[PDB]
Amino acid sequence: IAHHVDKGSLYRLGPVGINRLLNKASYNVINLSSNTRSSLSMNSMLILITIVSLLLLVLVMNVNFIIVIPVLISILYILFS
Amino acid sequence: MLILAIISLITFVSMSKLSDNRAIIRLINIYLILVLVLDSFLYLLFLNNQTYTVMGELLIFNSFTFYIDMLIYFIMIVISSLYGYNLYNNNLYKTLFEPKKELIILFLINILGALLIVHSNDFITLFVAIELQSYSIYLITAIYNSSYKASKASMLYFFMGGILSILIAYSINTYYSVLNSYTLHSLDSLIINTLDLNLILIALSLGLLFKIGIAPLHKWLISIYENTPILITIYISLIPKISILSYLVLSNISINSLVISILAILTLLVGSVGGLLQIKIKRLLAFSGLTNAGYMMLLLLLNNNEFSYLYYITQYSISHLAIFMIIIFSIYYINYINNQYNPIIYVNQLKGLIHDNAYLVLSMAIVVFSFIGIPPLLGFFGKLNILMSILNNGYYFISIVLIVASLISALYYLYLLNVSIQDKNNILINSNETVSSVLSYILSSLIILITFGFIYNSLIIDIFNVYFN
Amino acid sequence: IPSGALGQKVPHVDESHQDLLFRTSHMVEDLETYDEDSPINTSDANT
Amino acid sequence: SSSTPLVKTSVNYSYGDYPLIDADPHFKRVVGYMRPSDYGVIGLATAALPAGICFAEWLDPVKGKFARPSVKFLRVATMLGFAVGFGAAYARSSLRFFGVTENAREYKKDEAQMAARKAAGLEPYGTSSLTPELQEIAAKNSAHSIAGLFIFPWFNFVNHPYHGREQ
Amino acid sequence: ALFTSLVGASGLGFATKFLSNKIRLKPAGYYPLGYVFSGVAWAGLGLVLHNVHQHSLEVLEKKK
Amino acid sequence: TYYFIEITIFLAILCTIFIISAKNPMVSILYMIALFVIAAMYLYLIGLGIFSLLYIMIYIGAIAVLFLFIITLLDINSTELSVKSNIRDLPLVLISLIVLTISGLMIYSNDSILINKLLEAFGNDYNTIITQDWFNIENTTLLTTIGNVLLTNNAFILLVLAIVLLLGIIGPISITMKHK
Amino acid sequence: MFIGTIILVLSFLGFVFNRRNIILAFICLETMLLGINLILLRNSVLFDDISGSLFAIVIIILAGVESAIGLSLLVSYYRLRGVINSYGI
Amino acid sequence: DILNEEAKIVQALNNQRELTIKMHELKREEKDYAHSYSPLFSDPVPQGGSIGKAPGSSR
Ligand SMILES: CCCCC/C=C/C/C=C/CCCCCCCC(=O)O[C@H](COC(=O)CCCCCCCCCCCCCCC)COP(=O)(O)OCC[N+](C)(C)C
């Protein structure tokens, strides 16, 4: 209990696992714009992606709201990982 | 009376030499003070939420917008004090904190364009004022042109502001194509039911909001805030935020919007976990602005959000202003000055600040715990009154995402504290020259507001009750 | 060890980070030294 | 002909406790009806800007040790001080026309003056050199322009027929 | 009470004068006349805020 | 001479494609000047003969002259439209073309229905009936009414616009002087 | 509405996928403003009013001033770097 | 002596609760055009565009 439960798995749901999750999620969202030599082409393609993607999402989303929850979960997965 | 100052000022500045610039700013500083003191009795016009429209339904003047212009003048008095007063009389701080000849011109033209957004009733007033303040931020960014980073930042800000201004123009003329009108006073509670104005009004709000730095399109603004020098970036971070958000809160065109709720959740997420592993203090300091603009995107969904808004606005303004002024003051104690425009960059450079001027760390700790929302301080009641409006109106998942975002954002706020209360080997004992009396009094005023401003909450709620209801 | 709000390794930035191997590195615009505006990097800028 | 207002308008819609005088007074009436305390406010602001610059130099001097500011700064300070004082006095005096502050001193003057203009056999608010369309648009521009004194100065110089009153 | 409001706002002025002295790495009573200057200024702000709340209460009771 | 508007629409498409794919940077800018001329053709075509000459005076005669003047005495590198560079772009170009095109066509419509919103943009076929009424007695053309409403109802917009023109004077000077 | 919509959309996508130089970005910005003008002036003609013509004559002037401002911004970008890169700023 | 001083505080807190519920009612209440828009020129009727005007254009 003192090793595998209290120092083991109650820290994985606590301060030791959250540090690793936030380390990975922060690394991914900082490397979101690591790629291109260009500042301007990067950001102006990034503006295009969202005003396309949001419009596509609401096109899905007034049809049915159930089929757009996993789309947003997958967008969070590729954004934070 | 801003117009008078601009008209007087460019006349006066064309004839001054460059030796006189700093003193000119001092003049304008005192001028704005006597526009606050001698002219604020106009609050008596706005009893019981009496609203005026001026210039033929062109501008709208209520008490909300009166408070916003008072706030913008107070902040301009602080910023112009930062330019017009010396920190120290060294040959160091003269080559670091030096105003250009045309800096206060662009300051007052930007304050003009920022006021004509919040005071605006029609869409072409909104457009002309947005471009007035946008060209002013282009030129305020580009005015320290002997700098590679500020030049690249002004070019980037030009193109990314041009796109999002053409998106606002497209939304305005798209609104015009379905309604022969320019007002949102045209809407009047029945048209929204029988007309799909959703896509129009949301695209308008989005084109207005991407200039603040909301989350899908946030990185270009974080790069502009890191690349600009340390005095410019305290002004260009604050003024478009409060002007555009004070427009979009006064006009309630995105009430219960699904897109604004998506982007508010995403803003609270990416600002909290975005600035965690970051080692530059203006980066760290700009993701704080990203989260605190998320907390406003929340109030955009709201109907009747004027208390939570105005309280959290002057909260964030005082806290923002103070945390930039504290790291202006910490430049005297760092062992390494690079980069003449931006002399402190890395947040580990303030490492032994408790052993050199411990009361600067008392200052810092107060404003950082108010950023977190600790109850004796003023940021707590801002977050509290935002929660009282979020929960009143049915945004239950948004509430828990707000709480998790504030808990995650507390980490990199406390990282400033964790660095500054630490051991350092070579500490100061005896320093000959002093910090500015005029300018350290301003930082102490900004702290005493944050700590002892919870006293006046009930007075402020009663004065609220009379002038807005 | 300097730490970086998650217990991570962060670089201590002294004057020794702007050489010409540190010139135009591959990196994010965060966590990057070699500023372009430095009294050792300009050093007869418009002469 | 050239005085029918041809619109529908507030009648005695007072903005405070006290009854209104005008919904936008003419510039001549505001300069005519201002109190000696208002001229004291103008003198206060004219004195406070150069004294304020001298004060702020005495607190923190520009080049390290204290000198008086130049006379070229003191004269611009005095000009802008008269600008602040005139804006303050115009706003103060306009508040009495709107009925948001005490105006029993000026209410007597207006009933005396409109009785005089009835006795002289002319129009109650002045003959204007404008068509009534232009009078109406010109007074939609300057209606309640004392709010927003912080942004821009704007005044009423048109003799238009309507001022939020009856008969 | 008006007097308690004035004395408390003057205490806020004393606090901001003290804290600005101590940021400057001065002693506390470095310049002792700035204490009365700051106290009179913040007490004047308290005077303004008290009068505005008073007029506000009178407007609220006039809706009887 | 019916299909004139269709012809200007098609020629404008073709001119933008020649703008974004051009050897030399100023070959691209001359295609932009040609697009301004196609615009002024469309504006005379629809009935706005005043605006077309305003476009030729302001956009061609000042903005394009400033632009060509910039390209002359400044050095600008340019890659040309390699196929290795830009067909990595093409799938998102195609998706965003169809989506942004349909979406720009979407907001002229009021339906609950998605593609009734779309195909009411193509319900164009009906020929407007122009009637004569004899109610107007004078030569108030369009420039006269722009001068009436810039100057009476929107006089404040004209004066804030004067501040914008002032800023366009002050700013470029303030950048490029290097005071002593 | 067709000509203004398609010049705005093609102008926007030519701006977005510009990787070749910087002045293509400027001229794609100006052609975007042209397309906005086209849509608005057609709506003013169809609705029989000047108010779209009012916003159009104001946005002409604002487009001119933005071109002047931004090209001085490019000149100051060029002052310290006597070259403008092909990939961008 | 203490029950009365608690009933005084309870009355003073129920007064604040009544005041708060009232001031919440007051904002959601609809409001006049003369109070919401500018007071002078209280009618929403535009009558705009007065040079080449047609008789029969009013309704
Ligand atoms: C001679 C005086 C000259 C005028 C001075 C004006 C300076 C403008 C400064 C702005 C930033 C500094 C905070 C000051 C907050 C003032 C609160 C207030 O009074 O704002 C009101 C409530 O605000 C609201 O809803 C919400 C406001 C939230 C405030 C939250 C911060 C609380 C703690 C700081 C304020 C208390 C400090 C008092 C220290 C003695 C709304 O507008 P009012 O028409 O009634 O204004 C009237 C103020 N007059 C009379 C001085 C003109």
UniProtKB/Swiss-Prot annotation, chain F:
Lineage: superkingdom: Eukaryota
InterPro entries assigned to the protein according to its UniProt record, in alphabetical order: NADH_UbQ/plastoQ_OxRdtase_su6 (IPR001457), Nuo/plastoQ_OxRdtase_6_NuoJ (IPR042106)
Translocase among keywords: yes
Location in or out of the cell: Mitochondrion membrane
Keywords assigned by UniProt, alphabetized: Electron transport, Membrane, Mitochondrion, NAD, Respiratory chain, Translocase, Transmembrane, Transmembrane helix, Transport, Ubiquinone
Encoding gene per record: ND6
Name by which UniProt lists this protein: NADH-ubiquinone oxidoreductase chain 6
Catalytic activity: a ubiquinone + NADH + 5 H(+)(in) = a ubiquinol + NAD(+) + 4 H(+)(out)
Cited Pfam families: Oxidored_q3
Cysteines paired by S-S bonds: none
Root EC class: translocase
Record has GTP-binding as a keyword: no
Family membership: Belongs to the complex I subunit 6 family.
Originating species: Yarrowia lipolytica (strain CLIB 122 / E 150)
GO MF annotation list: NADH dehydrogenase (ubiquinone) activity
Membrane-topology annotation of the record: Multi-pass membrane protein
Assigned GO CC terms: mitochondrial membrane
Residues spanning the membrane: 1-20, 29-49, 50-70, 90-110, 155-175
Function: Core subunit of the mitochondrial membrane respiratory chain NADH dehydrogenase (Complex I) that is believed to belong to the minimal assembly required for catalysis. Complex I functions in the transfer of electrons from NADH to the respiratory chain. The immediate electron acceptor for the enzyme is believed to be ubiquinone.
Assigned EC number: 7.1.1.2
Record note on quaternary structure: Complex I is composed of 37 different subunits.
Curated annotation (Swiss-Prot), chain G:
Function (record text): Core subunit of the mitochondrial membrane respiratory chain NADH dehydrogenase (Complex I) that is believed to belong to the minimal assembly required for catalysis. Complex I functions in the transfer of electrons from NADH to the respiratory chain. The immediate electron acceptor for the enzyme is believed to be ubiquinone.
Keywords: Electron transport, Membrane, Mitochondrion, NAD, Respiratory chain, Translocase, Transmembrane, Transmembrane helix, Transport, Ubiquinone
Pfam families: Oxidored_q2
Ranges annotated as spanning the membrane: 21-41, 55-75
Subunit structure, interactors included: Complex I is composed of 37 different subunits.
Naturally occurring in which organism (per UniProt): Yarrowia lipolytica (strain CLIB 122 / E 150)
Family of this protein: Belongs to the complex I subunit 4L family.
Gene: ND4L
Gene3D superfamilies: 1.10.287.3510
Protein name according to UniProt: NADH-ubiquinone oxidoreductase chain 4L
Reactions that this protein is recorded to catalyse: a ubiquinone + NADH + 5 H(+)(in) = a ubiquinol + NAD(+) + 4 H(+)(out)
Enzyme Commission number, as recorded: 7.1.1.2
Gene Ontology molecular function, alphabetical: NADH dehydrogenase (ubiquinone) activity
